[PDB]
């Protein structure tokens, strides 16, 4: 699905549109403001993805402000933030959003996501010590997030890093189902299982770490590079276009102006079926972001391995 032009977009269940390409901001650092302004004003991005836990929201805010002061309406932008683990209790949801909106210098978010489906204690360590991973009242948290929508502070709500079982648990109790499920997706980790479950429920999927992140960057993968040279495009452009053809929005992160400009030029051309199949053919070995260092305590639990974080669905 698409919108057409570099204004390509997907449609959420609420009728609101999400631009197909967004700017990621994890580890964007003290360049964040510049990258956000450049991406929006010069490269024509209309979607920014951030989070409180990234520590860059104030910077994103200054960037968004500068971009809008140059004659772009707030309505045209799509801003996503995320509710962190330590704030996953009903009475912490609203204060967390207000802080995010204040740092971003906004009055509403377009999308507010559960960052991870795990509650952490205040002052939790990495890895977490005994009793620092707490019990999650998912139903109560989600009810409060529905209230944010009702008040108009958030236009849509959703989740990240979910399993099929956790999705079913949420879908049982929810009045407003999740608009978006944001997941690690790239060649080498398709996660078709979660994608199919989201497709069934009409939930839109955003591919995070679409280039394999910093840790396992795929821009010098032999197969990706072969396709890139064949089509006269960059490896990044191929990786991102591959995702759009699967039907997921993408949020590639870069702090370099030229890469920011490149990453959105993924419309008006396609990856042929043979090349698409070859990239899908890369085996799903391992994920870059396991959540092990955030939630796994091997000795005391309650989560003693990475497979327990993903409900044994790998
Ligand atoms: N929900 C979650 O839990 C979650 C988890 C991970 C990520 N995310 C979100 O998704 C966004 C993207 O994921 P990610 O930041 O992990 O990684 P990514 O976008 O897959 O990869 C970014 C890395 O590739 C480089 N890069 C960017 N464009 C390139 C190109 N055209 N050619 C070659 N290299 C390129 C970047 O370096 P330079 O910056 O130096 O250009 C950076 O090192 C994050 O910023 C965040 O918004 C969410």
Domains of the chain and any CATH numbers = 1-314 (3.20.20.100)
* Deposited experimental method: X-ray
Q: Which atom of ligand 1 is nearest to the CA of 212?
A: 20
User: Strand, coil or helix: what is 87?
Assistant: helix
Q: Is 290 annotated as a binding residue?
A: no
CA 37 – CA 44 distance, rounded (Å):
10
Active site amino acids: 54
Q: Is 30 annotated as a binding residue?
A: no
- List, chain by chain if needed, residues with CB within 6 Å of any ligand 1 atom: 24-26, 49, 115, 160-161, 182, 208-214, 217, 219, 234, 236, 251-256, 259, 262-263, 289
CA angle (134 as vertex; 129, 135 as ends), nearest 5:
155
What residue has token string 């092990």? 292
Ligand 1: residue of 213, 242, 250, 256 to mutate (most ligand atoms within 8 A of CB) is 213
CA distances from 71 to 66, 114, 161, 210, 228 (A): 9, 32, 36, 30, 36
CA 8 – CA 206 distance, rounded (Å):
14
Report resolution (Å) to 1 decimal: 2.3
Q: Report CA 70 to chain centroid distance, whole Å.
A: 27
CA angle (247 as vertex; 214, 57 as ends), nearest 5:
45
């Amino acid at each position: 699905a698409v919108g057409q032009g570099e204004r390509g977009h997907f449609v959420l269940k609420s009728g609101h549109t999400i631009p197909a390409v967004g700017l990621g901001t994890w580890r964007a650092g003290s360049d964040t403001a510049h990258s956000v302004r450049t991406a929006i004003a010069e490269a024509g991005y209309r979607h920014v993805d951030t989070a409180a836990q990234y520590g860059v929201e104030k910077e994103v805010g200054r960037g968004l402000k500068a971009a809008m002061e140059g004659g772009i309406n707030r309505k045209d932008l799509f801003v996503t933030s995320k509710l962190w683990c330590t704030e996953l209790a009903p009475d912490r949801v609203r204060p967390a959003l207000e802080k995010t909106l204040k740092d971003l210098q906004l009055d509403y978010l377009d999308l507010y996501l559960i960052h991870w489906p795990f509650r952490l204690k205040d002052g939790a360590h990495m890895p977490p010590e005994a009793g620092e991973v707490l019990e999650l009242d998912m139903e109560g948290v989600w009810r409060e997030m529905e209230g944010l929508v009702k008040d108009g502070l958030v236009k849509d709500i959703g989740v990240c890093n979910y399993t099929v079982a956790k999705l079913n648990r949420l879908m049982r109790s929810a009045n407003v189902p999740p608009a978006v499920c944001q997941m690690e997706m790239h060649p080498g980790w398709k996660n078709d299982r979660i994608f199919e479950a989201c497709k069934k429920h009409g939930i839109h999927v955003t591919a995070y770490s679409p280039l394999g992140s910093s840790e396992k960057n795929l821009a010098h993968d032999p197969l990706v590079e072969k396709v890139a040279n064949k089509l006269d495009k960059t490896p990044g452009q191929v990786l991102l276009r591959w995702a759009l053809q699967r039907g997921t929005s993408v949020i590639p992160k870069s702090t370099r102006d030229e890469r920011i400009k490149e990453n959105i030029q993924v419309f008006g051309w396609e990856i042929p079926e043979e090349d698409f199949r070859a990239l899908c053919g890369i085996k799903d070995e391992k994920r870059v972001l396991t959540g092990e260092e955030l939630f796994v305590n091997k000795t005391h639990g309650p989560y003693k391995s990475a497979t327990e974080v993903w409900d044994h669905e790998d």
